[PDB]
């Protein structure tokens, strides 16, 4: 004998038309003629934009920073589109089409001579940004199962999350940092310039607080 439990029911879910992901273009329609310098600073540190959910209850969350080029968009589009029930689920791009020109030279060039030519386009993705947002009358578990594939084939480390999962790990993140037993935290030492440590740190560190190092992000770092 086992007693039953009430099943979660979705009466409030409204499925939009064209639930499957839009095709995105290899190159923008108005190709950038002027060659841009590479901010690596756009992959660096925490993300400001696209941190929260909008319509959907599920998402892929980026744990590192990285560049997304057309190959990745293709991968996600196909993989998600044939992995979903178009009736019961819908997906959404939380990331723009690749807009940032990246140059190259022909292999075999000597150093110098000018900048290179535009090879392809990418999208910058800062750690903590939602890549793809899936809603529906789905339970998190199915979506999670096939979303983790996609997540795994992305250039940065990433996870599949729900609203519940995300707020879980955020409350855990702050609770870990008010639980902390040792008096010595990165913030505390860095801001007050103890041991003259500011010599070895970068200015950005004051904001990043030793959680972010380069494009990498370690969540365990308080």
């Amino acid at each position: 004998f086992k007693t039953l439990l009430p099943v979660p029911t979705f009466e409030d879910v409204a499925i939009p038309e064209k639930p499957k992901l839009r095709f995105v273009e290899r190159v923008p329609l108005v190709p950038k003629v002027r060659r841009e310098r590479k901010n690596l600073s756009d992959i660096r540190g925490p993300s400001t934009e696209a941190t929260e959910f909008t319509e959907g209850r599920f998402a892929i969350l980026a744990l590192g920073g990285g560049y997304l080029h057309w190959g990745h968009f293709e991968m996600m589009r196909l993989t998600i589109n044939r992995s979903m029930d178009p009736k019961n689920m819908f997906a959404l791009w939380r990331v723009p089409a690749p807009f940032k020109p990246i140059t190259r030279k022909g292999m075999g060039q000597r150093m110098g001579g000018g900048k290179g030519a535009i090879d392809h386009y990418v999208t910058p993705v800062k750690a903590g940004r939602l890549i793809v947002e899936m809603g529906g009358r789905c339970e998190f578990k199915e979506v999670q199962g096939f979303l983790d594939l996609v997540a795994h084939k992305l250039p940065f480390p990433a996870k599949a999350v729900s609203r519940e999962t995300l707020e879980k790990m955020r409350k855990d993140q702050e609770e870990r940092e008010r639980n902390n037993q040792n008096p010595w935290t990165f913030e505390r030492i860095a801001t007050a310039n103890m041991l003259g440590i500011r010599k070895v740190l970068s200015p950005y560190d004051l904001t990043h607080k030793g959680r972010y190092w380069g494009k990498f992000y370690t969540p365990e770092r308080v």
Partner: protein
């Protein structure tokens, strides 16, 4: 660029337990510092080198005494990682002119006026 550094005032707002901990009186600030230079100025920026020079802190592990006024506290704040600061104490009070020769400074940071009677 590595530069000089601001130190937010919040750092210098003491918590009520700190008084108990380091042995300072909640009510009255101490009058004088005994500053000692604990670290070396080498591998540090020129401006810290200068601050150390103008505090009389040139020689290591030698004590020096300074007013506890803000003018001084500013410089000390710049080099605070190079030094040890302990409050001067006067159990026997300040020395008179008869007591100048017999004065000595004990490591607990206290100035004894009569040293070695008979």
């Amino acid at each position: 660029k590595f530069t000089r550094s601001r130190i937010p005032d919040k750092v210098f707002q003491p918590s009520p337990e700190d008084h108990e901990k380091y042995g300072g009186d909640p009510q009255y600030p101490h009058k004088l510092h005994i500053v000692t230079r604990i670290k070396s100025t080498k591998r540090r920026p020129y401006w810290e080198k200068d601050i150390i020079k103008m505090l009389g802190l040139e020689k290591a592990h030698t004590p020096q005494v300074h007013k506890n006024i803000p003018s001084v506290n500013a410089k000390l704040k710049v080099v605070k990682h190079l030094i040890r600061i302990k409050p001067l104490k006067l159990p026997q009070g300040l020395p008179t002119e008869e007591d100048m020769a017999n004065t000595c400074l004990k490591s607990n940071g206290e100035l004894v006026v009569r040293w070695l009677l008979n």
